[PDB]
Design a protein around this ligand. Structure first.
Ligand code: HEM
Length: 153
């Protein structure tokens, strides 16, 4: 659980993300694929992208990043009260895409990296701490939903 001031730091930087959801979405996916290339194997229509520039020119990738960040934002705004919003992600992660929690740690690292690269002035230690706790809670609660659906990833 996060304190009310921790949630405000999370939503404060998140408001900055929403000034450019598409570009943040692209930088996060690209950072994920580069840091942890195994993750790119989950995306059938994205593994023909061989270069950073090709990934940025792909409209489908950009659209996907907005879909990912929109869902994540809607969860964060619930400040922990996110069972209704989380359940559909658990279901497709556990029953369709098979996305292990380690891969959610990978994209969590990418999110922190890009937030610090773009917003250092609104993402110092305390805000990094708060966002870390929020994503930790996200992963903890999706793991528990994964197991209720019979996925141990
Ligand atoms: C912050 C964490 C994440 C969020 C909020 C998120 C959200 C979403 C949403 C909203 C969709 C479309 C709906 C559905 O299928 O559920 C999607 C699809 C997808 N996700 Fe995730 N995702 C996350 C992390 C990941 C990671 C870490 C992987 C892989 C390494 C992944 C792989 C996929 C794939 C393969 C699809 C299907 C895409 C298609 O080809 O149209 N996701 N995700």
């Amino acid at each position: 659980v996060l304190s009310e001031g921790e949630w405000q730091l999370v939503l404060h930087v998140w408001a900055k993300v929403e000034a450019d959801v598409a570009g943040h979405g692209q930088d996060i996916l690209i950072r994920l694929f580069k840091s942890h290339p195994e993750t790119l194997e989950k995306f059938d229509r994205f593994k023909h992208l061989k270069t950073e520039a090709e990934m940025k020119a792909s409209e489908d990738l950009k659209k996907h990043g907005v879909t990912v960040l929109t869902a994540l934002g809607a969860i964060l705004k619930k400040k922990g009260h996110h069972e209704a919003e989380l359940k559909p992600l658990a279901q497709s992660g556990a029953t369709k895409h098979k996305i292990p929690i380690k891969y959610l740690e990978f994209i969590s690292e990418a999110i922190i990296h890009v937030l610090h690269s773009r917003h250092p002035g609104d993402f110092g230690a305390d805000a990094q701490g708060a966002m870390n706790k929020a994503l930790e809670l996200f992963r903890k609660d999706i793991a528990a939903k994964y197991k209720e659906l019979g996925y141990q990833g």
